[PDB]
Ligand binder design. Sequence first.
Ligand SMILES: [Co+2]
Ligand SMILES: [Co+2]
Length: 322
Amino acid sequence: TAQTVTGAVAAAQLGATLPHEHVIFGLPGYAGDVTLGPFDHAAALASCTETARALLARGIQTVVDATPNNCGRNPAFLREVSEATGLQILCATGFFYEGGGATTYFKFRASLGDAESEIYEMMRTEVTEGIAGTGIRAGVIKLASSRDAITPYEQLFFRAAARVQRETGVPIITHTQDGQQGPQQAELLTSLGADPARIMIGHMDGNTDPAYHRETLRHGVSIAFDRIGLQGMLGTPTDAERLSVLTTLLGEGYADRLLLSHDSIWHWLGRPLAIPEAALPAVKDWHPLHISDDILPDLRRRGITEEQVGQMTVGNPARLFG
Ligand SMILES: [Co+2]
Ligand SMILES: [Co+2]
């Protein structure tokens, strides 16, 4: 079964799934901006339930919320959104690339003792028992790595996650930075005995060389083109380039290892931030209805079959998260 924020759910009840999205999200530091950018709970609930309804209208029955522990993750809010709409939501346990922000805590602990075991205990507890005393369990572990390497600090989390994966069977989803380190993540996690049929290497659409994807897929893992709609921001490809690589890989029989998502943020934490005019095109399709309305029909137009589409959007998530 999949562990969702409203309880366990049968694999066959997951339905069409978006496997990497952010219902709410804050970059590390947002909490320090609380005076002028506090959480507007009513406004967030309204906006997020509206979005959940739009997804349910499109046949989407489950979303995997990939928000790390230090980026504003809020299981009780996700449960409110789920209970209000019927949309099934899985949440994550993990911390963001370091790299990234809010890293000083476990880096310091690592310097003074066995941080891997501490991380392992957090992950295990949040997967098996619950988060922050609420009884809401994480349904996926979230890992992230930097662009130029999986750093020794980041590896603490990879080794702790592999251990929890061996003991519980929990799925693992990842973040890759600027289209790098996919093969290394897959190789590291598999070498540690993690189950490749429960690993989704993320942000693989960030690289436009099919050979990079094929190398990752070699480890038996799945890969997600999960920032679909985010176009030419800070090195991201366009969707057209994404789909060009995807059609190639589909044509090589990889449909049962490919997944699709947006990495969208439905409500931003902190003060609202205005998108500069020049950047509007990059973010225009970066929202969770884009795959349903624009992408899937475009793949069908291209000769991708209904069976293949259902494999990416329903078959694979059932197997990976269920
Ligand atoms: Co990410
Ligand atoms: Co993300």
